[PDB]
RNA sequence: ACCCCCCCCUCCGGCCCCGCCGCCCGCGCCCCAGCCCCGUGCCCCCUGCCCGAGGCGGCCCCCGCCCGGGAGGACCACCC
RNA sequence: GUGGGCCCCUCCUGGUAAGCAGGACGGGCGAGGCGGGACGAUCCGGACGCCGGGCCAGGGUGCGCCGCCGGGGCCGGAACGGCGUCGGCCG
């Protein structure tokens, strides 16, 4: 947490995974943005940067607000790694700031599999 | 990651419930005060009724293994936030640990900060004609054993608080004085130039 | 219509006080109080007169301030004059003896039908009971709260009662002949 | 959503009939495809010429004026479970489909008749004077009064989002 | 025992809606559910709305019993009421309700950063 | 089909379970209520059970058969010798029942409490109570807590002990039970009661008077492992039964697929 | 109101007081109305995001058997 | 290979009737994954290679459990009864 100890952020908390009663998809993790009631309401917090923190090793995952969902101010979000069902309930931080993470904050099938045609160039 | 103490004076069972399930799994703490002024709608014989019928339903050879009815109004209100919960996963237990519920206020509550849920009280929820009681009342008919003690406990705190909130005005008047720390008011017109 | 309302002159001997429909009446007799704030209502209490109105009627409550005002009036005709209720003892071949106890607090009946068992009524407070002065067997109830004076006057009729018997014959018990107020 | 639509319509021309003849309706509908569904079941049931053989001259639509408030009565007749009635309704709107809207809702609350089940007979303008219901009558005078019927809507509505508070709002009245 | 009443020349603050946010005039009543209102000064046409959407005022500005709306508009000017309104406590509210509408993010992370602050002087003073 | 003739259950399901009893002796469970006013009394005793005999005794009823004859009736002779109060407890009725506010214990303890706080006293090193009697020595310590029971509990009571030195019995190590003060004015001078009674003898004459009523509390005899026919009391069986008419022959229908706590069973009795 | 619920009465996880005698944790108190709603239709909105000790509320710890008799008993246990 | 079928919708025959028995055009299960109808071989949608994005049918949107607000009304079962409440027609 040496990187983001300064960085002053809006709350926000992880409930679970996109889902019917039939099927999960963890692929895409549902969040819950402070003061954010309202579908309208959340072009302002769409594609900015948020993190949670994952209890062992005490080390941040990044990922970026991708998506509204439902009428009531809901979003969908894709972290850097997938996450695990024993994060529920914990809390996410939407940086008010901007910080460069590079290549860290984005989705391991955008990452790869994403088909620039990465060539395997062996030096 | 505080705690929402909600005093449970004026508020309809099912409606509190469902709010209080929500913002458990949402993993957070709840307390809730005086329960047996927590309202049901309906005639109180009604009521009545329902909680025999319901205290009719017992496993028929051996009863330590069926459901168990508890008649106290916090347990009531706490059965009734289990019916809402999933409470036989480990993340339904553990939103079940978060919370507390109580007769009356206790002194491990009684200088925390209440809130009310409007959009869930009676006054607000019921129409004029419709009838409706109080959970207390249903727990004294029901097998409740500690009515009069609950009522003799509110009063001398009542009368307690109530000498307190006379020192607590002339301690306001002094902290509002504070008129006169501009460290104060050169950001006070910062938060105006926003509202 | 939008409202529905009743309204009725404030005899000039008593004082009146409306707060949060809490109505308190006042003269010499005593003071009486009622809480009618089990109901919705607008009573209104200016220039000498009281109203008593219901917005938006849908159905029972249209009949409401017809109440209201009546039970008012009684409050009035208590507080001024009184209300005494007259009460008499029927029997045959078994005198009921009846005295007047907890000065004039109680009643006491003895010898209904020639029985062991003795009745001990309560007067509802306020309320007062004599033996009377001018003719034999009746009791004389009086109170200014015609609640209290009736209850207490029923009280003792459904105390005395013949059990697994025709009552079409044996009529026997202490029923109100006169229901009034008073005359000084 | 209900308009107001004219409809122009006539059976198709034959040799004993050069010029036949032609009929025009107001109808109430919500758009143009159900009007004039609705017009050739009427000129079917009345003049006994089907959608086959005839053509439809022209649907107008118009517009309306509003700004001040208007008496309707609508004289209609429906179809229950146990036959066909015939019924008188009155309302205070601006235009006529408008109007017609507040009808429609009514029916649908109180009498459960569905748009298909009910033929409207007479749609006109009543004077004040002229009116015959109370719920109608009751607004047709000068300097009426009411204190609001319905202000906890307002709390309620905020505390949808003020889901947590520090008092009990009031009710202001 | 009622002091505010729907009537022709009610001030109401609409509540809901397209133009949720506003003050308007009542001209007519239609029902116990409806009104014909019409502000011409703040931005509303005339229309129909149901009274579950309209927060009565106390102001009553007399006007004609049928007005048209540049009429309407000049009876309106005439009447001091709306600029009471705006004095009063609750309007000024209204006017703070339009500075904290139009936010962006950057500044949500200004006007929250200033809070703490609001919250630490407060207590450097509460404790005397 | 149903039982074709009516016949009761057997044996009262309001005293179950029938399993041996956990509380060490017979333990009161209540007491008598108290009445704001009445004289000052105690309420509890404890005895052991010495025999039997009978009497004779001239009736003085009044409508009975036996209104002015002699009738011979048992008696049951119980051995009592004086307690010794050693200790004082208040309580308070809360909105979760009876709690305790304190316990003030005497200056000095005798032999019979000591040996009731040891498993075996010969060889047990004894610290019981040793800074207690240190801090205690001087009353003022027991004044101040007395003061805080005065101020706020709502019942009082007292905390004596047997004296086996004075009967046959085998045990050396006393009984310890709480008689609590009822009656009174108030409950200040209950508690004066109870200091006055600190450290002293109680006699069962003070406690109870001649014609008055009892309640006795105790425990039962004992018989081990038993039968449905002694334990319960059911029918035995024909005598051409294959293997054993000291049974209940059906001990349920097929359903519920369960037996019932309401057939009987055989095991502790006593 | 033989009905129903509670008391008495039976079992009873847990907890409390008292004997011999250390740890940890948190920082937030008007009340009462809604057909007087007494001037409303707000606050909070940073649990680290820079917060961090008294008083007031919580938490953990704390205690032998064998051996022989018995009013106890299949073995155990129980009371001495 | 098969020559034991069965069910739905409409139309029928015997029978008091039946989750009874016997016939007819079309469709389905059989031999049809997936979602929904709490739960079901056949009902409502849609009939299938392995994945990533988007749109959405049928059914629904207090909490369990993915998803909402605004507006106008009212507040299993037969003959036969109801001065409960809201709306009409005829005199
Ligand atoms: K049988
Ligand atoms: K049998
Ligand atoms: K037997
Ligand atoms: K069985
Ligand atoms: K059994
Ligand atoms: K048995
Ligand atoms: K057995
Ligand atoms: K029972
Ligand atoms: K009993
Ligand atoms: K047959
Ligand atoms: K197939
Ligand atoms: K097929
Ligand atoms: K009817
Ligand atoms: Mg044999
Ligand atoms: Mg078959
Ligand atoms: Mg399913
Ligand atoms: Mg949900």
């Known amino acids: 947490m040496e990187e983001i100890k300064g960085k002053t952020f809006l709350p926000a908390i992880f409930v679970g995974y996109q889902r019917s009663r039939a099927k999960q998809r963890e692929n895409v993790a549902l969040v819950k943005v402070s003061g954010i009631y309202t579908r309208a309401e959340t072009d302002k917090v769409l594609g900015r940067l948020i993190a949670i923190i994952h209890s062992k090793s005490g080390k941040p995952i990044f990922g970026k607000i991708c998506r509204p969902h439902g009428n009531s101010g809901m979003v969908r979000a894709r972290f850097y790694t997938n996450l695990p069902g024993q994060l529920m309930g914990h809390k996410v931080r939407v940086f008010y700031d901007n910080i460069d993470v590079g290549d860290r904050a984005t989705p391991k099938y955008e990452r790869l599999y994403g088909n620039p045609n990465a060539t395997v160039t062996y030096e | 990651m505080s705690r929402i103490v909600i005093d449970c004076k004026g508020h309809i069972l099912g409606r509190l419930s469902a709010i209080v399930a929500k913002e458990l799994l949402h993993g957070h703490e709840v307390a809730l005060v005086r329960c047996e002024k927590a309202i049901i709608s309906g005639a109180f014989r009604d009521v009545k009724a329902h909680y025999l019928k319901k205290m009719h339903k017992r496993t028929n050879f051996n009863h330590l293994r069926g459901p168990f009815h508890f008649r106290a109004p916090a347990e009531i209100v706490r059965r009734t936030i289990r019916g809402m919960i999933p409470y036989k996963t480990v993340r339904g237990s553990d939103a079940m640990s978060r919370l507390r519920v109580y007769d009356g206020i206790p002194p491990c509550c009684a200088r925390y900060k209440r809130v009310v849920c409007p959009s869930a009280m009676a006054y607000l929820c019921l129409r004029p004609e419709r009838r409706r009681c109080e959970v207390g009342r249903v727990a004294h008919e029901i097998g409740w054993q500690h009515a009069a003690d609950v009522e003799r406990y509110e009063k001398r705190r009542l009368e307690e608080c109530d000498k307190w909130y006379q020192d607590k005005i002339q301690i306001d008047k002094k902290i509002a004085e504070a008129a006169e720390k501009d460290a104060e008011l050169q950001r006070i017109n910062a938060e105006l130039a926003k509202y | ?184 | 959503m209900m308009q107001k639509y004219i409809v122009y319509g006539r059976r198709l021309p034959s040799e004993k009939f050069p010029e036949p003849e032609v009929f025009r309706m107001t109808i109430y509908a919500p758009n143009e495809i159900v009007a004039k569904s609705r017009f050739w079941y009427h000129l079917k049931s009345l003049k006994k010429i089907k959608r086959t053989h005839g053509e439809i001259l022209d649907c107008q639509h118009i517009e309306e004026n509003g700004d001040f408030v208007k008496n309707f009565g609508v004289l209609l007749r429906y179809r229950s479970r146990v036959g066909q009635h015939n019924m008188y309704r009155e309302v205070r709107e601006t235009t006529s489909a408008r109007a017609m809207d507040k009808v429609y809702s009514e029916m649908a609350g109180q009498c459960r008749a569905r748009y298909h089940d009910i033929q409207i007979i007479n749609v006109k303008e009543v004077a004040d004077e002229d009116v015959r219901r109370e719920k109608v009558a009751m607004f047709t005078q000068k300097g009426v009064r009411f204190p609001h019927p319905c202000p906890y809507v307002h709390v309620k509505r905020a505390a949808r989002t003020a889901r947590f508070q520090d008092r009990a709002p009031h009710v202001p009245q | 025992s009622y002091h505010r009443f729907v009537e022709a020349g009610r001030l109401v603050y609409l509540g809901d809606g397209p133009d949720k946010g506003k003050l308007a005039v009542i001209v007519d009543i239609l029902s116990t559910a409806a009104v014909l209102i019409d502000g011409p000064t703040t931005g509303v046409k005339r229309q129909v709305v149901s009274l579950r959407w309209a927060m009565l005022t106390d102001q009553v500005i007399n006007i004609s019993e049928k007005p048209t709306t540049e009429q309407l508009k000049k009876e309106i000017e005439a009447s001091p009421a709306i600029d009471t309104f705006m004095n009063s406590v609750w309007g000024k509210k209204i006017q703070q309700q339009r500075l904290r509408a139009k936010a962006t993010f950057e500044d949500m992370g200004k006007i929250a950063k200033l809070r703490r602050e609001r919250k630490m002087a407060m207590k450097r003073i509460a404790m005397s | 089909s149903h039982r074709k003739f009516s016949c009761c259950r057997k044996g009262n399901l309001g005293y179950l379970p029938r399993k041996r009893c956990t509380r060490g002796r017979g333990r009161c469970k209540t007491f008598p209520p108290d009445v704001q006013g009445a004289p000052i009394h105690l309420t509890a005793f404890l005895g052991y059970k010495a025999g039997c005999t009978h009497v004779m005794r001239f009736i003085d009823h009044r409508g009975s058969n036996l209104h002015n004859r002699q009738a011979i009736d048992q008696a049951t002779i119980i051995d009592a010798p004086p307690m010794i109060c050693t200790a004082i407890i208040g309580y308070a009725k809360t909105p979760k029942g009876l709690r305790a506010v304190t316990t003030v214990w005497a200056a000095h303890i005798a032999e019979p409490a000591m040996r009731r706080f040891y498993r075996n006293y010969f060889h047990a090193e004894k610290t019981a109570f040793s800074t207690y009697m240190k801090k205690a020595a001087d009353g003022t310590y027991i004044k101040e807590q007395l003061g805080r029971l005065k101020q706020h509990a709502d019942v009082i009571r007292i905390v004596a002990h047997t004296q086996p030195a004075l009967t046959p019995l085998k045990q050396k190590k006393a009984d310890i039970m709480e008689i609590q003060v009822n009656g009174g004015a108030n409950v200040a001078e209950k508690v004066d009661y109870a200091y006055a009674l600190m450290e002293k003898p109680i006699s069962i004459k003070d406690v109870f008077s001649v014609g008055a009523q009892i309640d006795t509390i105790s425990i039962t005899r004992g018989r081990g492992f038993e039968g449905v026919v002694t334990r319960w009391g059911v029918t035995r069986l024909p005598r051409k039964t294959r293997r054993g008419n000291r049974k209940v022959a059906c001990i349920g229908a097929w359903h519920p697929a369960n037996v019932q706590y309401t057939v009987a069973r055989a095991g502790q009795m006593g």
Request: aromatic share 6%.
């Open chain 3, 1 to 184: 219509p939008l409202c529905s309302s009743m309204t009725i002159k404030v005899p000039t001997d008593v004082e009146c006080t409306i707060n949060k429909r809490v109505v308190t009446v006042k003269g010499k007799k005593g003071t009486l109080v009622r809480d009618f704030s089990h109901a919705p209502l607008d009573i209104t209490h200016a220039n000498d007169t009281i109203s008593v109105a219901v917005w938006f009627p849908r159905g029972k409550r249209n009949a409401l301030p017809r109440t209201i005002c009546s039970h008012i009036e009684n409050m009035f005709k208590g507080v001024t004059y009184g209300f005494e209720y007259k009460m008499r003892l029927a029997y045959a071949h078994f005198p009921i003896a009846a005295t007047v106890v907890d000065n004039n607090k109680a009643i006491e009946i003895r010898n209904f039908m020639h029985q062991i068992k003795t009745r001990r009524i309560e007067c509802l407070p306020g309320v007062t009971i004599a033996m009377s002065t001018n003719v034999k067997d009746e009791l004389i109830l009086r109170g200014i709260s015609i609640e209290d004076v009736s209850h207490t006057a029923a009280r003792i009729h459904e105390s005395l009662k013949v059990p697994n018997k025709d009552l079409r014959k044996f009529l026997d018990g202490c029923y109100v002949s006169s229901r009034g107020l008073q005359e000084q």
